């Protein structure tokens, strides 16, 4: 059993998210199929489920905006989320739910736990366009760093002294600002006596925009 | 249609290898039959079905995992913790419309370490750019729980600061935090004194780092 996932992963607010999950290997019917999402650094949230007959069930938090459809001709099922906001940025997984069980007196789905899972599609909702980062020095055991602000999209690679200085380096995760762009900080702790003799340069490379900052006391 | 809220305890379980871990899942209303599951998620990976039917392990799951409980109280037990087991664990109920718990992190335990607090004012180039960012850095601390408060001329600021935290390091098993306070150039040049106050378990008294505009 294999799950393939696709769909646009970079959208603007007040737009429609459309994702597709295709299953290979076993019988697409006799199984519930669910969409789940996970915001970056947060917990799992069940979005919805569908079966082969087209009957759906949704999370009450997303009932107004979510629509889950099915296509048994292609063994696929689709997710649609209208009126997007920054709160909808998340990794979206599809998963196989429970098995349909038939008895002459009762029929229903049992063991509605999720396995296997799709690879997961990251979706980012923001009105920002591709912009290069601005690198500002955070001047000074002494701590010193570089602030990488106003860039889009992820990621950005940060090194120190062309990769020489690696111990004591802390590169935090990027934060999505309200403006739609990202901000980041890279810091490093050094001996106080090296501040006068040794030079410190943060090498910041953002390949989406194809864009070395010296930090001075 | 039946809505069931699952709360996991504790939020963070700090244990050492070789010990046993006990995670609890409380349901606001009874979970029917044995319709509960546990999932394991490692950093930057897809969730993994760990257990279903309260106590039935999935294929390829070691004997060190055990499930128990019923009604509103459920438990996941890890007999001997391995370096692999340190991750996030979620409980999920499927007695009604499926719902997830908020998750419990099993992490490496170490000695309490106090953070080193530093403050960075905005660079003059950034001031000319039209925005100001003040950075408050908390370096090497344990446990993760720490409180950062911004004060601009003794005024408590809210809604204009953003935090970021690194994952527990592989060597010293510590955390690092950064709090960025973002202002406009006018709002920044209006006031003068900027401070961040850090409260932590390792600090006997809240440590405040401040600077005056133009220093």
Residue numbers in the entry:
A (entry chain B): 2 to 82, 82A, 82B, 82C, 83 to 100, 100A, 100B, 100C, ...
B (entry chain A): -1 to 27, 27A, 28 to 94, 96 to 213
Paper text:
The PCDN family is a lineage of antibodies isolated from an individual participant in the International AIDS Vaccine Initiative’s (IAVI) Protocol C, a longitudinal study of neutralization breadth in HIV-infected individuals. The donor in question, PC76, developed a broad serum response targeting the N332-glycan supersite (also known as the high-mannose patch), one of the key epitopes on Env, which involves N-linked glycans and amino-acid residues around the base of the hypervariable region 3 (V3) loop. All thirteen of these antibodies have a cysteine (Cys) residue at position 100 k, which is located at the base of CDRH3. One PTM that has been less frequently discussed in the context of therapeutic antibodies is cysteinylation, in which a cysteine residue in the antibody forms a disulfide with a free cysteine molecule.
The resulting crystal structures of Fabs PCDN-16B and 22A showed that their variable regions (Fv), including CDRH3, resemble the previously published structures of PCDN-27A and PCDN-27B.15 In each case, the CDRH3 loop projects away from the center of mass of the Fab domain in an extended β-hairpin structure. However, each CDRH3 conformation is distinct. The PCDN-22A expression profile additionally shows evidence of a fourth isoform, in which the first four N-terminal residues of the light chain variable region (Glu-Ile-Val-Leu) are also excised along with the signal peptide. In contrast, the structural data did not definitively confirm cysteinylation on PCDN-22A. The crystal structure from the 48,500-Da species, which would be expected to be the cysteinylated counterpart of the 48,381-Da isoform that we solved earlier, showed no electron density corresponding to an adduct on Cys100k. Considering that this method separates protein species on the basis of charge, such that increasing positive charge correlates with longer elution time, this finding indicates that cysteinylation of 16B appears to confer a greater positive charge, while the same modification somehow has the opposite effect on 22A. The reason for this may have to do with the initial charge of the CDRH3, where 22A has a higher net positive charge in this region than 16B and is then shifted by addition of a potentially zwitterionic adduct. Also, the effects of cysteinylation on 22A and 38B function were not tested and could behave differently in these antibodies from 16B.
